[PDB]
Amino acid sequence: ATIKKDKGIDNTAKIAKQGYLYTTNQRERLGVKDGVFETRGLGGKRIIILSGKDGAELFYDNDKVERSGTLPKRVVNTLFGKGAIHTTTGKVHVDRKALFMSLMTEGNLQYLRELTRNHWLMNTQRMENMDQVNVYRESIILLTKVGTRWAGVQAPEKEIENIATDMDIMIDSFKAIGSAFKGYRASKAARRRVEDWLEDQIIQTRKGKIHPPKGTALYEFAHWKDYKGEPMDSRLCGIDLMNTFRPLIAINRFIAFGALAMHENPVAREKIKQDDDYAYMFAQEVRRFYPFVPYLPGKVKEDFQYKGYDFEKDTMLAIDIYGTMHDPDVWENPNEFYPERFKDWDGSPFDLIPQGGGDYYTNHRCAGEWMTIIIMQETMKYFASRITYDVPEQDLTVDLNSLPGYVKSGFIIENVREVVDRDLEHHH
Amino acid sequence: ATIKKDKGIDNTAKIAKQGYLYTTNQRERLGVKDGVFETRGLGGKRIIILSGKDGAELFYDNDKVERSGTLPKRVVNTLFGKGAIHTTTGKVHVDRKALFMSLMTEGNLQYLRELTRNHWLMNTQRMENMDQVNVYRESIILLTKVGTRWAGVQAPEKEIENIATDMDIMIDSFKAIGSAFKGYRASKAARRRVEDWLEDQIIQTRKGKIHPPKGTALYEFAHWKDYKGEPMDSRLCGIDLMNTFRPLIAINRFIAFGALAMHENPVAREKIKQDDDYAYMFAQEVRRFYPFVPYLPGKVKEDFQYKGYDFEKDTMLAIDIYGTMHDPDVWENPNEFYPERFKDWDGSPFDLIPQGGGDYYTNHRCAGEWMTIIIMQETMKYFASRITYDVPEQDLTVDLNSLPGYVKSGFIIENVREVVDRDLEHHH
Ligand code: HEM
Ligand code: HEM
Ligand SMILES: CCCCCCCCCCCCCCCCCCCC(=O)O
Ligand SMILES: CCCCCCCCCCCCCCCCCCCC(=O)O
């Protein structure tokens, strides 16, 4: 056939202005029904947007799609860092992706679970004594302590908020989807400050001056050698060591979304309390329902055909992350928050894709998915059952046209109080 | 018969100089074998020292023994505070003892267990970053945070060590067993500072200005009324509210003893790791084996006879706490540290008496025994299995002739490192 087209020499600024609704706005407008359409952006480039489970499966087929060299360069410069694993391909990628996955052991993840639970439990008194708590800001300080500890890197108390704020600026910086913007240079400065500190950690580890525990990211990254037997240079080593816990800190976006989901859906709170499996499904439904990753780029590796369309080598592609996750043919009632839908989920690698799809070892899928689910499950259990609080009057708006997805207020709470059954006697 | 006697117009200074060994030194010397002997102290007063399970049972018989008015008045002034529950008798005592026991709910004790576990888990990084850690000092700061939280009283971070040090001075002050001493006035000042702060907590609770959680000591004590319908005056209320968590902080003495027991007995460490029930028995054996309470005073309520001796009304008595617990006819091999001995223990109220014997509700037995066992069990599990450390060269001496029992160094440790199995994969 002939791919339907959003016309224009370059629709980059229209894509940015419409945000997470851009792709579905065009599909509805043009009546496309096989989840393929075309547009132009990033300086007049032809871009084919894929959606749906079959779109996702095609996008993660290493015979059809090539990933390297498709990320806009200002996004690399602020989100991932130059030379980062996201920018690698072929043998080099599978080699280094193996390093990242070797941190995802059952024992390291259980450590991560305990760190998250104890940091929340210990943060209760501090939250009780504040007048108001911005969950999005509070999460990000808490997660910075958890993630620095989990990675084996040193962050004394007086650096924590510095590091948090710098983390917050880097995660936010994908909003320009390749453009320079107000904050581009502030984001590069935050990246460099943190990169410097992690490169120094690496160099002190290699020189025997500090001793991170075996099995932590800092230890393993410092002492790793690639398949040619070479270690990563100290600067690239710090860059990829940061890709180990900057995204961890970014879970604060989902935590704010989860607190809002519980507020908009009071039944979900009582049910998180009563059942750990609902807490898991609640966290999965937060990652499906709320906006974070809009789409991801790649390009055609060699010519192929798909649903009757011809795909030409080096034509730019994009997998629609948000749109696939709100496609009614993929998720019934896609704009209702309904965690129980995961009772019926078959665990496909191609429909729950908020952090990528495909295969962790041979695709570019998020290495931290399991870590993300563990942290969200712990945090939501905490908020549902360990504390009670008031949600004051505030702007809880989530503007789907603005990247990135945020609760406008950051979700404020007040009158936090720990939940302790002190009159439970053994007669009860 | 005729009670054997340590002769002297007054042997107070000899009792003090010999410490936890005084009673057994005299029994061996005089060949007593029914655990009764006599001496003079506290200004020429006749004192009959009882020991053994039958000594303990007699001492806690409310028909034979009267407790009120027997504690030396400088000990009341520094340890317990004037008007304290320890100084009450009859209906007034059973009434107020019921208040204290109503805090010992299964739900409040599980709260206490969680507080202890999470505070230790969170303290690991701080200990890892110190060069050396004095376990006795570190415990006492940690326990101050736990006990203030558990009691529902406010202690901001910058008061914690102030409060700790003041707690430490008050617990230490029973060493003069009635005498004025170097530090008497320093101990009264620490008592008054803490009493003032707790009386203010009480008054702000009654006036509705602060809102402690229902079921905490602060809430229950503030709002309690006695059997005549009267609440405690605010100053006495603070005094007895302090008897709710100053002794909790005093568990730091046992914690230091427990760390030393693990060091002197390496097998006990591996066994605490492998089994929660050994951890319980280890904590019980620390309370039996190491010196803390030497003996407690009372007096004869009405005339009676016991093992052939005549007991005259108002004759002063003392139950030998340390000596009963190291009597070979009560504990086989009483000076070997052997936790497994509690496999054979029948739970008698009269032989494991490191915090009193008899009945919690109608005797003056420690209201915080269960709390003490919970804290010791959690703390010993932590030290045995969550961290590893070095024990440097130091004076680990426990001078049994000096009240109170201390590890001379406070038990120093270094090179603390959390224990995390990060290479545990699900194949293992
Ligand atoms: C919690 C700890 C996390 C870790 C350790 C982590 C780590 C990583 C790494 C190393 C990659 C690159 C892997 C590769 O190139 O093969 C990646 C990719 C990615 N991550 Fe994460 N991440 C975490 C959390 C998150 C969060 C909260 C999000 C939010 C949406 C996220 C979204 C993504 C996306 C969209 C990709 C790209 C997938 C693709 O290119 O196909 N990650 N992550
Ligand atoms: C952990 C929290 C603790 C609490 C809440 C607590 C509380 C109390 C209270 C309220 C009393 C007076 C009860 C009455 O007069 O009827 C008492 C007595 C006593 N406590 Fe504790 N205590 C704790 C820990 C300790 C510790 C570590 C020791 C160390 C040996 C100890 C030793 C004693 C002794 C010897 C008595 C006197 C028993 C008697 O007079 O027959 N307590 N405790
Ligand atoms: C309509 C098609 C437009 C295609 C434009 C290509 C622009 C690519 C945008 C890239 C967005 C990446 C979003 C990743 C945010 C992840 C934050 C934490 C996760 C991590 O750092 O790994
Ligand atoms: C040989 C007979 C001498 C009798 C002398 C009577 C002197 C009485 C000494 C009293 C010692 C009390 C020891 C209590 C220490 C308890 C510390 C924490 C427990 C708490 O505060 O409840």
Numbering used by the authors:
A (entry chain B), B (entry chain B): 2 to 429
Article excerpt on this structure:
The X-ray structure of OleTLA in complex with icosanoic acid revealed a unique flipped heme and a substrate tunnel configuration which are different than those of other CYP152 decarboxylases. Significant distinctions were observed in the FG-loop region (residue 173–175 of OleTLA) and the β-sheet (residue 388–391 and 413–419 of OleTLA) at the C-terminal. The cavity sizes of OleTLA and CYP152N1, which have unusual heme binding, were measured as 2693 Å3 and 2637 Å3, respectively, whereas OleTJE which has normal heme binding showed cavities of 1149 Å3. Three tunnels of OleTLA including the main substrate tunnel pointing towards the FG-loop (residues 173–184) and the loop with residues 61 to 83 while four tunnels of OleTJE including the main substrate tunnel pointing toward other two loops (residues 60–71, and 80–83) were identified. We further analyzed Chain B of OleTLA which binds C20FA in comparison to the C20FA binding in OleTJE. In both structures, almost all residues surrounding C20FA are similar in the two enzymes except V76 (I74 in OleTJE), Y296 (F294 in OleTJE), I178 (L176 in OleTJE), I50 (V48 in OleTJE), and I16 (V16 in OleTJE).
8456. The enzyme can bypass the use of redox partners to supply electrons by efficiently using H2O2 as a co-substrate via a peroxide shunt pathway, enabling a convenient in vitro bioconversion process.
